[PDB]
């Protein structure tokens, strides 16, 4: 929710809605960076998950 140039992610809710992909606007590009071992990520995706 805090991408400093917001144009990078403004279309993401609409794209996810158009493709029927569940999306959540979550707090922290730093938190997603901790998720993906980076400083920031600005996005995080799950495509396959274990049984």
């Amino acid at each position: 929710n805090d991408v400093d140039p917001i144009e990078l992610v403004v279309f993401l809710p609409a794209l996810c809605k158009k493709m029927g992909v569940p999306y959540a606007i979550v707090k922290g590009k730093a938190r997603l960076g901790t998720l993906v071992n980076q400083k920031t990520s600005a996005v995080a995706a799950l495509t396959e998950v274990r049984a």
Partner: protein
């Protein structure tokens, strides 16, 4: 387009055996490109109409396509761009509630 063999007249020029060279990938610079069609549709959804596009839609709905084309020619550069913009606006109007 076959030459007449003489130096004057409609299809003037020497009669030569034509070849029809292979089409260059240029001349397809403004192609359809489903990718860009999808992206342009999505962006048109995310960002709505410009103020002049809203005014053009109002003019199409109320005062007529000729007035809309005049205003679009004033706003944009030329008559062809005005015609294309008015066609896009009335397509938007059709795709709106009055399907």
């Amino acid at each position: 387009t076959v030459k007449t063999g003489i130096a004057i007249g409609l299809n003037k020029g020497k009669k030569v055996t034509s070849m029809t060279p292979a089409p260059k990938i240029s001349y397809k610079k403004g192609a359809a490109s489903n990718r860009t069609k999808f992206v342009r549709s999505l962006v048109r959804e995310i960002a709505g109409l410009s103020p002049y596009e809203r005014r053009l839609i109002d003019l199409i709905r109320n005062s007529g396509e000729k007035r809309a084309r005049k205003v679009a020619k004033k706003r944009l550069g030329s008559f062809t761009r005005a015609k294309a913009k008015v066609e896009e606006m009335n397509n938007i109007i059709a795709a709106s509630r009055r399907h």
